[PDB]
């Protein structure tokens, strides 16, 4: 029993910034299972970011290129995705997922309790 709620999305121009938030509620023991995904119109939901196995590490999709940064507040069961230098290619719905199990944190199939998502539109 877990519930995820995203926020922070909106309209922005090329090169602008957004900060996305995800609040987790229910039977969740840590924010490490949380991971960000995004899905564009007529495209497959693709991985974006999630914590790394060893402390101090973070996994990012190849298209991030240092532009995004994943941080967390365990005490409040929340994770944040700071998105800088946005391009029109980053337009999509950004979903927050919780890692059920498996052993591949880059695979959307190992995530559940998806949220409604927050729209990100980069105009240009």
């Amino acid at each position: 029993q877990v519930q995820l709620q995203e926020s922070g999305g909106g309209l922005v121009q090329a090169g602008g910034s957004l900060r996305l938030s995800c609040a987790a509620s229910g039977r969740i023991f840590s924010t490490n299972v949380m991971g960000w995904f995004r899905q564009a119109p007529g495209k497959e939901r693709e991985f974006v970011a999630t914590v790394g196995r060893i402390g101090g590490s973070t996994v990012y999709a190849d298209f991030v290129k240092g532009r995004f940064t994943l941080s967390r507040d365990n005490a409040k069961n929340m994770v944040y995705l700071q998105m800088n230098s946005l391009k029109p290619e980053d337009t999509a719905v950004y979903y927050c997922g919780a890692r059920i199990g498996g052993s591949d944190r880059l695979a959307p199939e190992n995530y559940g309790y998806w949220g409604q998502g927050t729209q990100v539109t980069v105009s240009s």
Partner: peptide
């Protein structure tokens, strides 16, 4: 997959 791993330290 091909991904990037960022190390804070």
């Amino acid at each position: 997959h091909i991904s990037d791993i960022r190390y804070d330290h």
